[PDB]
């Protein structure tokens, strides 16, 4: 009796293997939603009508197909738009966006200061590096997340630092008490994981406002953010990283969370 919605999905085979699971496909179809793979080997405008597109692909060809799609079909949502995803690719611009949140709660929300190093010479000669407290978080300045060496790494000593490839961004990583909070966000829904960095949770209303703010600022429905407590004061939180469309299939109950999401998106008013 009631009509059916197509969710097209354009994902790499490994993301497909991990995120598109029998349980997801079956729950979604049970509620009237058909997850349908997108032929990477064929144009998007040549592909069957969609009420919703989700993807995690990069590259000029894909972005092009999506811009075309967006022009041709303004009412069909894209999760997430390529321009919104680009906002994550420069670490310094990403954190620029997070700076623009209003904080106007009894918990405070800061961004950590960063050192940017652009060449081999600087990595050896820059005096300021010799007054940095290890361990350090290092990330290439522009990445995307695709290459394995576009990921955050710890550095325990100067010698480890000198073997990294510039341009990179460094952050002191010492005020956190050995605890990271990975926060997974799916539209208006938030979930939170204490993890022990170096291989006592924040107030839930606070985390919700932060997730709310990042979502409005980045224009992404699917991300996680890492945060730490500043254990100097013990009421101050710092966002240290944001990653697009993370590995939700590790969270139990993810199929229910993503199916409710998919359904919210295909009733977008």
- Chain positions contacting its own copies, by CB under 8 A: 90, 92-93, 95-96, 99, 108, 110-119, 121-122, 126-133, 141-142, 166-167, 172
Q: Is 1 labelled as part of a ligand binding site?
A: no
Is 96 or 256 the residue whose CB approaches Cl ion more closely? 256
Is 29 or 121 the residue whose CB approaches its own copies more closely? 121
Q: Does residue 16 bind Cl ion (CB under 5 A)?
A: no
Q: Is 230 labelled as part of a ligand binding site?
A: no
Cβ atoms of residues 231 and 2 within 8 Å: no
Q: Does residue 247 bind Cl ion (CB under 5 A)?
A: yes
> Which residues are CB-contacts of 38 (< 8 A; sequence separation ≥ 6)?
8, 9, 10, 44, 47, 53, 55
Alpha-carbon gap, residue 216 to 233, rounded angstroms: 29
Looking at residue 44, what DSSP letter applies? G
Smallest distance from its own copies to CB 261, Å: 31
Q: Which of residues 29-58 bind Cl ion (CB under 5 A)?
A: none
Q: Is 226 labelled as part of a ligand binding site?
A: yes
Q: Is 243 labelled as part of a ligand binding site?
A: yes
Sign of CA dihedral 116, 117, 122, 127: positive
Q: Is 187 labelled as part of a ligand binding site?
A: no
Alpha-carbon gap, residue 251 to 257, rounded angstroms: 10
Q: Is 240 labelled as part of a ligand binding site?
A: yes
* Closest CA relative to residue 117, chosen from 99, 94, 96, 92: 92
Stretch that binds Cl ion, among 6-14, 62-70, 162-170, 249-257 (CB under 5 A): 249-257
Smallest distance from Cl ion to CB 254, Å: 8
Alpha-carbon gap, residue 215 to 197, rounded angstroms: 25
Alpha-carbon gap, residue 143 to 254, rounded angstroms: 27
Smallest distance from its own copies to CB 40, Å: 28
Is 131 or 204 the residue whose CB approaches its own copies more closely? 131
The listed partner (its own copies, Cl ion, none) that binds 179, CB under 5 to 8 Å by sort, is none
Q: Does residue 18 bind Cl ion (CB under 5 A)?
A: yes
Tokens of 94: 């990403």
The listed partner (its own copies, Cl ion, none) that binds 141, CB under 5 to 8 Å by sort, is its own copies
* Closest CA relative to residue 110, chosen from 196, 245, 232: 232
Name the residues that contact Cl ion, by CB under 5 A: 18-19, 247-249
């Amino acid at each position: 009796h009631p009509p059916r919605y197509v969710i097209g999905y354009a994902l790499a085979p490994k993301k497909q293997q991990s995120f598109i699971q029998p349980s997801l496909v079956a729950q979604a179809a049970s509620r009237g939603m058909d997850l349908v793979p997108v032929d990477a080997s064929q144009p998007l405008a040549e592909q069957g009508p969609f009420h919703l597109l989700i993807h995690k692909l990069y590259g000029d060809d894909w972005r092009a197909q999506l811009v075309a799609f967006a022009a041709r079909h303004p009412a069909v949502p894209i999760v997430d738009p390529p321009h919104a995803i680009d906002r994550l690719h420069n670490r310094i611009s990403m954190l620029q966006v997070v700076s623009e949140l209003d904080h106007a709660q009894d918990s405070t929300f800061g961004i950590p200061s960063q050192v940017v190093v652009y060449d081999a010479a600087a990595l050896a000669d820059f005096g300021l590096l010799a007054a940095l407290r290890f361990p350090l978080i290092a990330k290439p300045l522009v990445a995307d997340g695709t290459a394995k060496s576009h990921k955050m790494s710890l550095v325990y000593h100067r010698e480890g630092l000198g073997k990294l490839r510039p341009p990179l961004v460094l952050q002191e990583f010492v005020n956190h008490g050995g605890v990271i909070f990975k926060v997974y966000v799916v539209g208006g829904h938030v979930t939170c994981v204490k993890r022990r960095s170096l291989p006592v949770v924040p107030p839930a209303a606070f985390i919700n406002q932060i997730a709310g703010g990042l979502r409005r600022a980045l224009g992404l429905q699917l991300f996680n953010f890492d945060m730490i407590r500043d254990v100097r004061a013990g009421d101050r939180y710092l966002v240290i990283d944001i990653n697009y469309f993370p590995g939700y299939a590790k969270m139990p109950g993810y199929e229910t969370v993503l199916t409710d999401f998919f359904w919210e998106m295909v009733h977008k008013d």
